[PDB]
C-alpha cells in the first residue's frame, strides 16, 4: 500500500486523537508527526486506498469537535516516488 492520508490541525490534541482514530478505524501504518509551526500539527499515515479513505473519513468526522478542529482533510492515493524523500 502506497496510499497516503494525512491531516493538519490547530493544536496537537486533535492531531493525536485523529491519529488514534486513523490506526483504530482501519489497518494503516503511521509514518509522520509534523510540528508545522504556528499551531499547525500534521499527522501522516500510509496504507492501502480503501483503509486510508475509511480511516481518514472517520477521523476527520470525529475531529472537528475536539480542540480547535481541523485545518484540511484531503488524500492523495498515489504519491510519486520523488515525494517519498520529502515525506
Amino acid at each position: 500500500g502506497i496510499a497516503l492520508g494525512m491531516i493538519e490541525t490547530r493544536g496537537l490534541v486533535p492531531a493525536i486523537e485523529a491519529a488514534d482514530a486513523m490506526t483504530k478505524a482501519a489497518e494503516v501504518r503511521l509514518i509522520g508527526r509534523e510540528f508545522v509551526g504556528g499551531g499547525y500539527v500534521t499527522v501522516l499515515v500510509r496504507g492501502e486506498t480503501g483503509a486510508v479513505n475509511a480511516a481518514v473519513r472517520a477521523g476527520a468526522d470525529a475531529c472537528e469537535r475536539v480542540g480547535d478542529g481541523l485545518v484540511a482533510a484531503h488524500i492523495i492515493a498515489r504519491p510519486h516516488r520523488e515525494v517519498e524523500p520529502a515525506l
Binding site: 475509511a54 473519513r57 468526522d61
Partner: peptide, 22 residues
C-alpha cells in the same frame, strides 16, 4: 476547487467534513 480529476471535491464521509484526503 477545480475539476475532480486530480483532486476530489467535498466527498463527505459521516458529518460535514470535506475529508478530500488523497
Amino acid at each position: 476547487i477545480a475539476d475532480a480529476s486530480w483532486k476530489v471535491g467535498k466527498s463527505e464521509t459521516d458529518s460535514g467534513q470535506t475529508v478530500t484526503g488523497t
